[PDB]
Amino acid sequence: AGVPPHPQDLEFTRLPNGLVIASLENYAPASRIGLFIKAGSRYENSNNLGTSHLLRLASSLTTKGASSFKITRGIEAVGGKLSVTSTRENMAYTVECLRDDVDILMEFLLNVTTAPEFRRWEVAALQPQLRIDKAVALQNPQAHVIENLHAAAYRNALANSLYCPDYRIGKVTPVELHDYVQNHFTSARMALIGLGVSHPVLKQVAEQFLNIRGGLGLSGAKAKYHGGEIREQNGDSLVHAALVAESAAIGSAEANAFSVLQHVLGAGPHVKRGSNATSSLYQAVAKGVHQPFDVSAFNASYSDSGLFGFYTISQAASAGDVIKAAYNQVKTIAQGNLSNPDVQAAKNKLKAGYLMSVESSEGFLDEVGSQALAAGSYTPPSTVLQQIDAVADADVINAAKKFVSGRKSMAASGNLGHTPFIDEL
Amino acid sequence: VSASSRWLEGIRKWYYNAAGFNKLGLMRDDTIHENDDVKEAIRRLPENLYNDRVFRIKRALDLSMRQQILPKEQWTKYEEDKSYLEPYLKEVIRERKEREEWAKK
Amino acid sequence: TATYAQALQSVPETQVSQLDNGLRVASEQSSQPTCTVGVWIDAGSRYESEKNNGAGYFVEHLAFKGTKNRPGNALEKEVESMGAHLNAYSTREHTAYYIKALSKDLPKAVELLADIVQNCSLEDSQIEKERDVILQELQENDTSMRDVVFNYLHATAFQGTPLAQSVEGPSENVRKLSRADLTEYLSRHYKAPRMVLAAAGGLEHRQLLDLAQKHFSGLSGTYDEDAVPTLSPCRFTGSQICHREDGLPLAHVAIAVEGPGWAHPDNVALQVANAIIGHYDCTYGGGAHLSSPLASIAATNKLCQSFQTFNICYADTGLLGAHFVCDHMSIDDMMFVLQGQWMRLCTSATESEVLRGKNLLRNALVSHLDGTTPVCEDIGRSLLTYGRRIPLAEWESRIAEVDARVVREVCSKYFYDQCPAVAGFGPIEQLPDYNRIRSGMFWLRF
Amino acid sequence: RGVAGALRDLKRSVLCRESLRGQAAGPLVASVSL
Amino acid sequence: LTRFLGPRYRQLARNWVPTASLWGAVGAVGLVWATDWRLILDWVPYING
Amino acid sequence: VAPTLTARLYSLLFRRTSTFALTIVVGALFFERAFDQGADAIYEHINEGKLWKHIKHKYEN
Amino acid sequence: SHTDIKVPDFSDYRRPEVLDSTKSSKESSEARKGFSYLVTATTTVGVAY
Numbered sequence A: 001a002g003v004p005p006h007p008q009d010l011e012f013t014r015l016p017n018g019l020v021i022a023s024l025e026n027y028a029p030a031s032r033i034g035l036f037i038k039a040g041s042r043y044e045n046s047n048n049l050g051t052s053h054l055l056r057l058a059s060s061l062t063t064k065g066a067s068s069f070k071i072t073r074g075i076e077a078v079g080g081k082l083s084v085t086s087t088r089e090n091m092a093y094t095v096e097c098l099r100d101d102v103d104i105l106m107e108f109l110l111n112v113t114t115a116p117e118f119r120r121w122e123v124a125a126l127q128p129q130l131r132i133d134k135a136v137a138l139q140n141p142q143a144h145v146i147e148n149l150h151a152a153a154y155r156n157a158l159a160n161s162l163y164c165p166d167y168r169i170g171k172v173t174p175v176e177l178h179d180y181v182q183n184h185f186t187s188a189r190m191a192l193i194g195l196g197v198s199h200p201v202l203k204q205v206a207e208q209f210l211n212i213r214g215g216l217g218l219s220g221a222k223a224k225y226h227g228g229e230i231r232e233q234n235g236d237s238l239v240h241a242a243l244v245a246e247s248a249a250i251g252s253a254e255a256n257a258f259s260v261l262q263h264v265l266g267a268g269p270h271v272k273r274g275s276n277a278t279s280s281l282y283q284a285v286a287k288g289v290h291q292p293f294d295v296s297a298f299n300a301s302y303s304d305s306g307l308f309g310f311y312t313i314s315q316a317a318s319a320g321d322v323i324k325a326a327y328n329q330v331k332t333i334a335q336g337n338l339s340n341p342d343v344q345a346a347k348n349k350l351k352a353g354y355l356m357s358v359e360s361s362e363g364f365l366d367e368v369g370s371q372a373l374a375a376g377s378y379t380p381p382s383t384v385l386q387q388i389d390a391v392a393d394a395d396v397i398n399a400a401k402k403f404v405s406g407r408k409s410m411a412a413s414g415n416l417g418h419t420p421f422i423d424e425l
Numbered sequence B: 001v002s003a004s005s006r007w008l009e010g011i012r013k014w015y016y017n018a019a020g021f022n023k024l025g026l027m028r029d030d031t032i033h034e035n036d037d038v039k040e041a042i043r044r045l046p047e048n049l050y051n052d053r054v055f056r057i058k059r060a061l062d063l064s065m066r067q068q069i070l071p072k073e074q075w076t077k078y079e080e081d082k083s084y085l086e087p088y089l090k091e092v093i094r095e096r097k098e099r100e101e102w103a104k105k
Numbered sequence C: 001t002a003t004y005a006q007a008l009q010s011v012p013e014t015q016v017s018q019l020d021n022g023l024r025v026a027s028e029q030s031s032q033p034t035c036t037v038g039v040w041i042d043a044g045s046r047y048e049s050e051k052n053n054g055a056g057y058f059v060e061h062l063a064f065k066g067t068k069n070r071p072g073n074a075l076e077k078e079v080e081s082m083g084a085h086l087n088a089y090s091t092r093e094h095t096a097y098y099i100k101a102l103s104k105d106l107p108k109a110v111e112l113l114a115d116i117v118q119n120c121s122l123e124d125s126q127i128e129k130e131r132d133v134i135l136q137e138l139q140e141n142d143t144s145m146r147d148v149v150f151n152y153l154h155a156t157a158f159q160g161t162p163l164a165q166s167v168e169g170p171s172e173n174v175r176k177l178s179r180a181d182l183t184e185y186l187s188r189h190y191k192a193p194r195m196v197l198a199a200a201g202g203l204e205h206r207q208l209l210d211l212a213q214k215h216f217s218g219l220s221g222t223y224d225e226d227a228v229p230t231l232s233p234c235r236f237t238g239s240q241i242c243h244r245e246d247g248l249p250l251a252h253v254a255i256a257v258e259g260p261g262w263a264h265p266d267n268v269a270l271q272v273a274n275a276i277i278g279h280y281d282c283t284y285g286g287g288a289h290l291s292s293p294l295a296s297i298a299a300t301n302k303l304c305q306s307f308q309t310f311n312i313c314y315a316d317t318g319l320l321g322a323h324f325v326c327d328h329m330s331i332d333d334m335m336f337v338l339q340g341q342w343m344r345l346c347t348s349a350t351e352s353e354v355l356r357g358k359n360l361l362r363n364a365l366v367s368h369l370d371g372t373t374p375v376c377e378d379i380g381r382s383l384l385t386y387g388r389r390i391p392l393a394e395w396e397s398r399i400a401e402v403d404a405r406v407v408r409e410v411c412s413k414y415f416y417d418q419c420p421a422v423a424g425f426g427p428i429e430q431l432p433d434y435n436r437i438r439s440g441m442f443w444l445r446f
Numbered sequence D: 001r002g003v004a005g006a007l008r009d010l011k012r013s014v015l016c017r018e019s020l021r022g023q024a025a026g027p028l029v030a031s032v033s034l
Numbered sequence E: 001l002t003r004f005l006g007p008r009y010r011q012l013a014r015n016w017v018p019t020a021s022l023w024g025a026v027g028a029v030g031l032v033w034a035t036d037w038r039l040i041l042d043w044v045p046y047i048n049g
Numbered sequence F: 001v002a003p004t005l006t007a008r009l010y011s012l013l014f015r016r017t018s019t020f021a022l023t024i025v026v027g028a029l030f031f032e033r034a035f036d037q038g039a040d041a042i043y044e045h046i047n048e049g050k051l052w053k054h055i056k057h058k059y060e061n
Numbered sequence G: 001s002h003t004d005i006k007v008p009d010f011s012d013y014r015r016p017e018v019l020d021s022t023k024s025s026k027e028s029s030e031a032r033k034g035f036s037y038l039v040t041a042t043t044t045v046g047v048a049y
């Protein structure tokens, strides 16, 4: 019988300095460790914009315990990996390797995050990588729109871009990197997660090397939702557009209602080259639009705010038709036209999607690290499905009501000669 | 530790004045031979130290053209000679030796 | 504590069973709420003739469009309603249809897969609508220089053979493929001993076998009298194809020698050597300090935007080599450094770098089989190529056998003084002449 | 390799309606590595 | 110039000693042949003429 | 001799450049002895009476 | 549309061994190289003499 052993359940610890440790021994051949930090681009201000982007690119620069040459060769010697993933709220320093080399890569991880030197010449040589890295990301039109959508939505913090403003390329200083690490990479802002690691080891590492004090308080300044529109005329073949309203902070019950509304409206495709029969946005637009297009509900939740809406791609001349058809479909939901089989199928898509998002070690580690910083706890899957089941249909209708009546934020790129402004919707 | 130390330092100060690069306003690190380790260290110098190094060498070459020296007041005093380049060069050498030790295994 | 070696023993054994009709049923049980299950078919464009070269890809466009039991989007609604995901792909040798769904939905997921692979209703109205879709996809694929240059490499390397054909087929075939061509393709290739019902996730192998006898017993396991397809060996040809197009901003180059195939033990040592050469992207953080000489030289001197090594396996043949993308004044230097590393590994491979390649492959193997869907693919595809699931403990044994001598011997066998196949696309005026490339495959000093 | 995920050299062209599905964004993430 | 003393460099020398031995045979035979070195060629069987 | 003759010459002698050069220098050695031997035997057969080494027997001393 | 490209037939140029699409070129890989490199080695021998 190839029945597997009994799976060990995760262990979790909050140290009195605010640091969070969470380990899971899955006895896998590989180990994964990640240091999640409340250091995303929201914590930049108008004087040091882009500092967290350059910081994201500087994980292999020289540290006090490891030269730049050694970090690259030591990790590659044991076939390991070092990555830095960054959202508007978090930075996630993750390291992967086989079980027997965790000591090696933990030491590199601690040096990168707790003892970088930011040598003036090494930083100078890295500045052009901001332009390369930004250019590679921004050849997806989706990256432009979402970055402009946040700049238009918020007055500060969440308005900040994941990528360095062009005027700052070459201008980010080693002092700014030092200052950014010193007041954001602190114990009360950190979470040390490890898969294929023992809890005593992580707890030992955390107490020995991650007892960093000083710095700043949690979450910095609050994100002030504004509303507005940013329009980028570039004559692309297709018009990309996003229309949203403020929705709900992550961790609140109202956020689950928005998540369920997302899968009622239609989040993404489930069948290859399918017509998206159960996608209410796609069928609404498909009625009076026969040209090619795409439409999808957009859901972004943060510590102190959120954005909900939809994202459209269409021909430049059909942009207004696609947008107005999509917006009206949400209005009918706000008007109470929502069946119970619709919400139950959406819960199935949502519940199934969550479980599928944590079957890999990479996706599991990111979820546990995200929960540790957002919620300060670990919520197992069964409890998450419980919270999803608790969403009532009236909660979903109310979220749709909040979107229709809320002050809108919009971003669009392309030939915008037929893309409406907000006041034309 | 004055007795034996000051005699050694006394012979070093003798040699320093005998070398005579101070007579052109130069410092010791201005006279080092530029190999690959030294070009990198010079590259790593901050703006002010680089610009100071450039003008002192330019002033010395101008003197060498004219077969002149500075007045004695403007000679580089042995006690005031700053080894501004040595710490950068030491790191550059330490980095190269690390590469070489990795190239052996 | 637990070691790396001990962790390899903890991997569950992949159970295997075969139905009476010949359908092979394989599964690796985990402790997961989700699973991936699908059918891997030993069919692809290498089995297709010049007439019907686009049929299997055409069938992929029709597999999810309706069946005799669930016509129209009825299948599409059942998958979406239970939150599951339905997907498929076709290569030159293998076709796959698989579903990602909750473990509780495994009985329905298996039922749908059986309905798709047996009772696909290829309605004429749907065939004509998927005609224009495929043609539009051909226009899109023309804009991907990576997909183009790799089809060019196959076109010249295996010229005159079935492997020279593309998976999607030519433009002309898609406008005259009839329903009879597609049904003849299906009824001739979708036989039970060439299909593998693979699954992975939270599920007992018993229930998968029950669902197999329940929904796949109604399948023809009796081949035709003498219409059993047999793959002929495909002649490799040292040759070159150069699509000069200076209007494009970067050159794409693919070069390769003939590999041995899926079941050859030498693939392990070849993959170690490719790991030593590795890959590069202009967004990597290592740059000058990267271990691979090709990668560090390319980063420091800006010789390319990216390169990748590959070992593409087929039945008794394959493409072993690399591909890169660079400015028009850098093609010659990239070719020079690339070939220099091939010759260096043939003649002067050291022990420490080989331990590097072994370690990279160990991490690449373990990190890839991380999730229900990659494991389900490794189950289905391995049973077609190897006829069995090769446990990770066996791969570790083959990797550990590799030392510097093995890499020098294995690489010389396939690289040294061999005729490569070259494929060039873009601003390729500086692409070296074939004789000069061929001369780069040996060293006068050796 | 550098990543930009938001869904929850001339790149290529998207022409038909089948190849557009999945492209509409659905909270950006940026990832860098070695 | 001590940096060339290491395990990798002695594995590299071991890979190239068969080749350098053979290039010595090429030069030795080439020198004997080009100069008609009677001291060595008297021992070769058929060459004796 | 089931493998091709040219095939066995390549695997043994021509694959490496070092042995490819050794076969040439050793070939020029044995080629020089046989070529001069056969060439001189042809020049002498056409001129059998005429040469001095064909008349050296008359002048014993 | 780039899939409409096929490499033309070289059958009236190929060597005898490599004309069969259903036969591996590895079979005659050994002999073909030796024939061409034999011609080179003979040329050097003649130049050498």
Ligand SMILES: CCCCCCCCCCCCCC(=O)OC[C@H](COP(=O)(O)OCC[N+](C)(C)C)OC(=O)CCCCCCCCCCCCC
Residues within 6 Å of the ligand: C417, C442, C444, E026, E027, E029, E030, E031, E032, E034, F014, F015, F016, F017, F020, F021, F022, F024, F025, G036, G037, G040, G041, G043, G044, G047, G048
């Ligand atoms: C103390 C005295 C020492 C002397 C000892 C005698 C040394 C004899 C030479 C030995 C070196 C032979 C090495 C060699 O052949 O490589 C150079 C090229 C390449 O040959 P190739 O067959 O093209 O490719 C070699 C690949 N391999 C090794 C894997 C089979 O092969 C060639 O191209 C050589 C043949 C070309 C001859 C024409 C060049 C000579 C100058 C032209 C003179 C005639 C016109 C005036």
Ligand SMILES: CCCCCC(=O)OC[C@H](COP(=O)([O-])OCCN)OC(=O)CCCCC
Residues within 6 Å of the ligand: C439, C440, C441, C442, C443, C444
């Ligand atoms: C004493 C001889 C020194 C070596 C000179 C020599 O052989 O030149 C190299 C080329 C053949 O090597 P390649 O062009 O295949 O490049 C192989 C690289 N891997 O040979 C030629 O055809 C050049 C003609 C030289 C005649 C003087």
Ligand SMILES: CCCCCC(=O)OC[C@H](COP(=O)([O-])OCCN)OC(=O)CCCCC
Residues within 6 Å of the ligand: E031, E035, E036, E037, E038, E039
């Ligand atoms: C460097 C230039 C060398 C040229 C010397 C020379 O004239 O060679 C003549 C001898 C003749 O061989 P031998 O058996 O009569 O011996 C007669 C002894 N005098 O051949 C040799 O001995 C060649 C030796 C090569 C050594 C580098």
